[PDB]
């Protein structure tokens, strides 16, 4: 929508994910404008509490970027994802965590 840029979303672990070993689940949102944005981390279909985020910054094209993160432990059974809401989106967007992405 013009001066409004939809965010790119990357969900991933800080360290190579090994089942049972504590780690950090990340959701990196970039390329978006305006800065008002909502990012949730999801576990097995429910919101994760205690999700922190970096300080709002922007790139050369003035589009903003943020890192959302919280501690987590990858397992065999647990499904993790990010859900991002923005003015550019008609629905909240869900991006599931791919272990090798």
């Amino acid at each position, epitope marked *: 929508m013009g001066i409004q840029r939809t965010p790119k979303i990357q969900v991933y672990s800080r360290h190579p994910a090994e089942n049972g070993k504590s780690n950090f689940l990340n959701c990196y949102v970039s390329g978006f404008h305006p800065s008002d944005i*909502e990012v949730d981390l*999801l576990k*097995n*279909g*429910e*919101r994760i509490e205690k999700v922190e985020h970096s300080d709002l910054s922007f790139s050369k094209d003035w589009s903003f970027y943020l890192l959302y993160y919280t501690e987590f432990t990858p397992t065999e059974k647990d*499904e*993790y*994802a990010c*859900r991002v*809401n*923005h*003015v*550019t*989106l*008609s*629905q*909240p967007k*869900i991006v*599931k965590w791919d272990r090798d992405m």
Partner: nanobody
Amino acid sequence: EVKLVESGGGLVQPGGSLRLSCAASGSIFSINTMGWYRQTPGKQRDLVADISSGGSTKYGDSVKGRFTISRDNTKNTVYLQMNSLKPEDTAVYYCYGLSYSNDDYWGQGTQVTVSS
């Protein structure tokens, strides 16, 4: 297939109250979080309230203290008690659900109009 059936939308005076309801069909244990977003034309849909199968609840800032969400897992139904409705609560209210694999589902939405 999971379907989200909503009811309760309509017209209400400012300061009044309305009770929305949403039942999940086609599944009895597939859906974890169920809740409500609201949307006016042209903008994003904002979280109103949602609640997991374990009772973990979250409210949007603009409805905290006035709205109460509740849930009956045995028939997969959520309830939205909307108290002290202002004209700014006028929007389409979408029920939604999350599977335990983070698959989202959405209802058709109910229009809620607060006007004197």
